[PDB]
Design a protein around this nucleic acid. Structure first.
Lengths: 106, 170, 148, 192, 61, 124
RNA sequence: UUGAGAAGCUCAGACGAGUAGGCAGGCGUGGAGGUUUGUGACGAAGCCUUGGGCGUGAGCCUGGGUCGAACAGCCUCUAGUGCAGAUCUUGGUGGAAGUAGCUAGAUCUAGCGAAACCACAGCCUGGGGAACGGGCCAGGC
RNA sequence: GUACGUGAAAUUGCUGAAAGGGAAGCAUUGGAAAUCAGUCUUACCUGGGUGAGAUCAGUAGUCUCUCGAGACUAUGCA
């Protein structure tokens, strides 16, 4: 059919790292469909979230969300830097993300 | 009880005066815009007027069932669909106090609802519906004049596979 | 006194205790591990078999220096022995727990060894290792149909 | 005098000083601020005014340099009206031409002592649970005797003894609904 | 069950519960996240018994 | 005014987790050939004055108040003027007869007590 | 404007590796003078704790449990005052080990039973300059 | 409970939970699970009514200090 999907699919690649030092405060996010740093400027400031599930349920809901915001582009290939309210776990490398269309300026 | 009992360091005189918000160029009244967040996410609605910060927006009741509601201007995508005639409907009644949440009051005495929990319930007054019934009366002919507008606002916006929001124009 | 296990309330438990028993601590730890959780009637047969070398006690933890045996396949291993002095002490304690349960008026057909623990008594270059042994026997807990 | 007194008490030893990490406090009853300072020391300040409470009434206490060697007559006392506006003016009139810092600190203490009396009156009207102490000896005694009582109770033995007893007496109808047919047959043969 | 709200007292609850058709009122006293007392009163004017609970153990335990 | 803590983890003594004989309390490493003293990469941190917290918010609890140890009612009355800066903390050796009278007195004074519900029960 | 512990308060700028060594201020322990009109059988001290808090730190405060008769903060005085090492001293206790073996029965079983040693570990291949392989780096397992 | 006040650490047994391809191992950042602190609206302002009483009386006494300053007593509550 056709769902809602008012967001854009994205992937968690890695932390902002050098060769041997990592900085989990900033995460590198690949917004799929964005292919250059100029294109990444559209998604700057948008709200990105990591939706996952836990077996224990809270308020009758098993879905937990970590909210973040895209800060700046990273590299020439359209990858961006995102800072989350809680630093994303290291195990979520390659995990999917949702990039909202808000806040909007179009 | 009135002479200040403590040091009470008064805040220094701030120099942050309140100036009116500058809305976007394309967020004009009568624009068909897509709601991005809330319970009506994806719904297309018609902008009646711009409040101090938000947009007093509504979808026609008989089209998509979106009542007269405030929406933040950052949470709205303004599509380039043809404008709707809104100069014919008065919007002075849509103020900050009009949408303001009714004050949580009620001098409930001890016991009964205070303890036994026989609480009352809320309901939208017919006054809000009466004003609402007027706006679609002055808006439905406008949307019916141009083709597909009635069907446009009924549908809900969504993103399909291979849709790049940065590239494709709204 | 108080035992190591939260059971041994009057409800369904019969206690037997042996302090400063003159037996090796490492041997007793293996015998206790074997008969733990097993029914009281079956335990008497097992201890009877070991005395007649019909059955062997598998040594799991302190398995050092224990030869291969063909009687340990019941427990999944092959290192087993036939301790007698340690088994004799456990036979005396089990009879004491069985007699305590009988005096309590407990149902004797459902008794199982709920808890058995061996602790090291004070040591007394030939300081051997005496053993503290405590045994709790209780009925097998059962369910009842709810409403239908 | 005053500068000699302060050096002896403020910097060598005062029995009223509570040495805290961020600040030093004063155990003196005649200190307006409750802190150990040069200006709030009642001992080192020959002219000193404070407000304190006696059985629900706030009084202005003042001492002068000329009564410093008569401890029984050192401090003079006046009544401050329950009306706050009149109480402020009473401090202003009695402390006339005193330094503005001393009048300021007396009016600040009058506000805190008025709020405390107000809060004391409102606590009396309210119904608040009474705090009852926990006695370590009685808790140990009751915990041990309870363990003996629970063992001596034999709950399961006594529960099933009564349940069977009321089965015999037929507290139920003709045949009970909680018993299997075979058990009920055994009951009938045994009881008759 | 009725959650205890605001500043309603036991005697007020008893007088309010009596007119609502209640026969016995049970009040559970808890502090520091532990129930330690139980007072039951017999409406409307019956004797009130004050107990102290101990060794509380729910079904899961 | 918000309390900012430069660090929340304590500074443990080096090699304190490998030996029970070596306590967790911080000891300066005197070894010259020690990697911890020379501050290599991966080595633990050491107490430096840079970690010192803001003077204004120093000694402040997360609720914004500074602890004041109280042994009797006379101690708690000192906080009449400083009830918005300090919280009463009844000492551990003060009996339950005095803990109740300190808590009732601190209630009228408008003073927060950090351990007001200790060694007592309630009776509504 | 109250912000005179003038030993306080306040404003500004620069600066921050560190062995030997130099200097300053603090934390903790036993006892002594003074003090807190101090704490304590309604529970002192001690100990336990994935309870909480404070301090850059030494450390300190506190809840719960255990416990049972004493004890502490502040100013000063005093010293047999702070430990991971000394093939340290005394005591306790481990792995080695139910091993090496030494009393019975039929090499097996039973019974009785050590000591040396012990930073921790335990697959290779290379390179890693100072050995580096056992810890390090790139590869196999 | 005479293996007797308190009863630490090393060490041992049992039970529970978790982890586990030839080490553990600690640090940094989060997740998960468990478990805690950790808090709330309740008071202020402005009334009006009702009565209440003193620090109010177009009031009378006593006591202690020094006229008037505190403590009370009787009466009125305008």
């Amino acid at each position: 059919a056709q769902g809602h999907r008012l967001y854009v699919k994205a992937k968690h690649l890695s932390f902002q790292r050098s060769k041997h030092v990592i900085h989990p405060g900033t995460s590198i996010v690949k917004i799929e469909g964005c292919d250059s740093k100029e294109e990444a400027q559209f998604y700057l400031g948008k709200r990105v979230c990591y939706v996952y599930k836990s077996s224990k349920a809270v308020r009758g809901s098993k879905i937990r969300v970590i909210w973040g915001t895209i800060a700046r582009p990273h590299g020439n290939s359209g990858a961006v830097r995102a800072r989350f309210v809680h630093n994303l776990p290291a195990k979520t490398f390659g995990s999917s993300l949702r990039v909202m269309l808000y806040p909007s300026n179009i | 009880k009135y002479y200040p009992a403590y040091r009470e360091n008064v805040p220094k005189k701030a120099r942050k005066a309140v100036r009116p918000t500058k809305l976007r160029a394309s967020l004009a009244p009568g624009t068909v815009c897509i709601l991005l967040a809330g319970r009506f996410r994806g719904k297309r609605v018609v902008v009646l007027s711009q409040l101090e910060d938000t947009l007093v927006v509504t979808g026609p009741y008989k089209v998509n069932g979106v009542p007269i509601r405030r929406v933040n201007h950052r949470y709205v995508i303004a599509t380039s669909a043809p404008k709707i005639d809104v100069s014919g409907v008065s919007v002075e009644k849509f103020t900050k106090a009009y949408f303001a949440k009714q004050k949580r009051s009620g001098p409930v005495k001890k016991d009964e609802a205070f303890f036994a929990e026989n609480a009352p319930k809320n309901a939208l007054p017919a006054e809000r519906i009466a004003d609402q019934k007027a706006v679609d009366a002055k808006l439905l002919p406008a949307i019916k004049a141009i083709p597909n507008m009635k069907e446009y606002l009924a549908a809900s916006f969504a993103l399909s596979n291979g849709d790049r929001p940065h590239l494709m124009k709204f | 006194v108080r035992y190591s296990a939260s059971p041994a309330l009057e409800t369904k438990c019969a206690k037997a205790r042996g302090a400063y028993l003159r037996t090796h601590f490492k041997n007793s730890r293996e015998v206790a591990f074997t008969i733990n959780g097993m029914s009281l009637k079956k335990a008497f047969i097992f201890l009877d078999n070991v005395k007649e070398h019909k059955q062997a006690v598998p040594f799991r933890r302190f398995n050092g220096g224990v030869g291969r045996t063909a009687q340990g396949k019941e427990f999944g291993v092959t290192q087993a022995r036939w301790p007698v002095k340690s088994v004799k002490f456990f036979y005396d304690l089990l009879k004491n727990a069985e007699a305590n349960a009988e005096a309590k008026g407990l149902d004797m057909d459902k008794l199982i060894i709920k808890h058995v623990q061996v602790n090291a008594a004070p040591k007394q270059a030939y300081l051997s290792s005496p053993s503290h042994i405590e045994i709790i026997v209780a009925e097998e807990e059962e369910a009842v149909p709810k409403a239908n | 005098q005053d500068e000699v007194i302060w050096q002896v008490v403020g910097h060598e030893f005062c029995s009223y000083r509570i040495k805290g990490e961020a600040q030093n406090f004063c155990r003196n009853e005649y200190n307006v601020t409750g802190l150990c300072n040069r200006q709030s020391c009642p001992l080192a300040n020959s002219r000193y005014a404070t407000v304190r409470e006696d059985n629900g009434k706030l009084y202005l206490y003042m001492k002068t340099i000329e009564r410093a060697h008569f401890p029984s007559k050192l401090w003079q006392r006046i009544k401050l009206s329950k009306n706050y506006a009149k109480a402020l003016e009473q401090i202003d009139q009695q402390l006339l031409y005193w330094p503005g810092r001393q009048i300021h600190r007396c009016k600040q203490r009058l506000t805190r002592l008025t709020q405390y009396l107000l809060k004391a009156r409102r606590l009396a009207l309210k119904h608040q649970p009474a705090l009852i102490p926990i006695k370590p000896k009685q808790a140990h005694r009751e915990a041990s005797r309870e363990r003996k009582a629970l063992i001596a109770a034999k709950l399961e033995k006594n529960i099933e003894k009564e349940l069977v007893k009321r089965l015999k007496s037929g507290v139920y109808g003709d045949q009970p609904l909680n018993v299997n047919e075979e058990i009920w047959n055994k009951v009938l043969a045994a009881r008759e | 069950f009725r959650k205890r709200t605001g500043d309603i007292e036991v005697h007020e609850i008893a007088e309010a519960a009596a007119k609502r058709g209640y026969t016995d009122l049970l009040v559970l006293n808890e502090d520091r996240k532990k129930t330690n007392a139980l007072t039951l009163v017999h409406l409307p004017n019956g004797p009130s018994f004050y107990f102290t609970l101990s060794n509380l153990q729910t079904a899961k335990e | 005014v918000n309390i900012i803590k430069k660090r929340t983890k304590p500074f443990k003594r080096h090699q304190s987790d490998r030996f029970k004989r070596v306590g967790e309390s911080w000891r300066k490493p005197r070894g010259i050939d020690s990697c911890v003293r020379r501050r290599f990469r991966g080595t633990i941190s050491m107490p430096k004055i840079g970690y010192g917290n803001n003077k204004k918010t120093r000694y402040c609890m997360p609720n914004g108040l500074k602890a004041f140890l109280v042994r009797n009612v006379s101690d708690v009355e000192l906080l009449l003027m400083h009830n918005k800066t300090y919280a009463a903390e009844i000492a551990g050796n003060v009996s339950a007869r005095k803990r109740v009278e300190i808590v009732e007195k601190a209630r009228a004074l408008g003073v927060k007590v950090t351990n007001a519900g200790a060694k007592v029960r309630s009776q509504e």
